[PDB]
Amino acid sequence: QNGYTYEDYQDTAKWLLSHTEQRPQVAVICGSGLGGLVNKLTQAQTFDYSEIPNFPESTVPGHAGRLVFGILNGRACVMMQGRFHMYEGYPFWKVTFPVRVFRLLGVETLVVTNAAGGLNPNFEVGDIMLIRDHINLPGFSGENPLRGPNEERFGVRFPAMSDAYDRDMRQKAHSTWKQMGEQRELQEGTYVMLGGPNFETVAECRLLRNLGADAVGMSTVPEVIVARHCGLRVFGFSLITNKVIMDYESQGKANHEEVLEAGKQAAQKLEQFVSLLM
Numbered sequence: 717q718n719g720y721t722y723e724d725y726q727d728t729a730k731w732l733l734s735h736t737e738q739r740p741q742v743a744v745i746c747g748s749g750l751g752g753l754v755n756k757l758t759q760a761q762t763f764d765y766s767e768i769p770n771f772p773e774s775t776v777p778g779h780a781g782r783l784v785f786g787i788l789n790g791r792a793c794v795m796m797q798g799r800f801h802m803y804e805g806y807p808f809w810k811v812t813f814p815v816r817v818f819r820l821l822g823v824e825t826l827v828v829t830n831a832a833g834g835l836n837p838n839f840e841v842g843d844i845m846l847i848r849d850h851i852n853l854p855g856f857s858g859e860n861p862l863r864g865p866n867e868e869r870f871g872v873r874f875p876a877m878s879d880a881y882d883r884d885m886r887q888k889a890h891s892t893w894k895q896m897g898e899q900r901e902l903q904e905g906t907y908v909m910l911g912g913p914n915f916e917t918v919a920e921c922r923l924l925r926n927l928g929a930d931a932v933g934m935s936t937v938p939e940v941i942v943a944r945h946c947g948l949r950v951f952g953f954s955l956i957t958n959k960v961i962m963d964y965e966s967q968g969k970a971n972h973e974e975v976l977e978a979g980k981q982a983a984q985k986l987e988q989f990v991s992l993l994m
């Protein structure tokens with residue numbers, strides 16, 4: 717299944733370690749329309765995904781496709797300014813490749829972000845939802861980045877996922893929000909991932925909500941599974957970019973354009989939160 721050898725991850729971590737002096741302790745993966753979180757890094761050193769051996773390439777609008785090292789609020793971080801998705805043609809073992817490289821780089825905590833359509837009726841476009849848990853739909857069928865022989869050098873054969881999203885960090889993230897001075901509070905809930913690229917139908921939307929999901933996207937989950945597998949501390953949030961249409965009369969239609977726009981209108985609020993969070 718997984719086509720990368722332990723040495724492939726090594727090779728790439730070796731490459732990065734010899735091209736930058738930066739020794740990141742934290743990794744941030746910036747979802748759709750969230751590339752601006754790169755803006756405040758100091759001593760920033762950028763590498764295009766195209767120049768890093770073994771790295772996949774971002775082909776979705778709103779994904780720069782650059783890995784940026786730097787300092788943010790005192791912390792040494794490496795940011796994925798743009799990510800990879802299954803709908804682009806990538807098996808999960810490709811999508812999550814950076815995650816294992818980060819572990820090899822010496823990173824200890826991974827913060828994942830994404831743009832998600834809201835399923836919980838109380839969410840509003842612009843809301844930031846702390847990811848308390850997830851439902852891995854592709855995983856139900858075996859589409860899993862861990863599928864195939866297990867590399868004990870990364871983790872165990874059957875890793876647990878019920879404690880995936882660090883509770884401490886969600887506690888902190890909430891008080892940090894207090895300091896934000898934001899009107900609307902920091903939401904929290906279950907994120908469900910499905911393949912995409914098409915947006916949901918009304919039946920699907922109703923179905924997903926009844927599964928207990930608050931937000932839906934086409935990313936994040938596989939990165940978290942790989943992160944946990946290799947022991948990374950995980951924290952994640954979705955920016956509610958649109959409310960998925962749950963009725964046959966709504967003239968509304970989900971679209972990537974509005975999603976990127978909502979990301980832009982919130983990258984500021986997100987900029988400080990993630991930094992103060994640092």
Ligand SMILES: Nc1nc2c([C@@H]3N[C@H](CO)[C@@H](O)[C@H]3O)c[nH]c2c(=O)[nH]1
Pocket residue numbers: 748801830831832833834910912915916932933934935957958959960970971972975
């Ligand atoms: N499944 C799904 N994804 C998204 C997204 C995310 N952003 C991109 C689509 O705009 C995809 O990568 C997806 O993960 C935003 N809104 C929605 C939505 O309503 N449904």
Ligand SMILES: [Mg+2]
Pocket residue numbers: 759760761
């Ligand atoms: Mg430099």
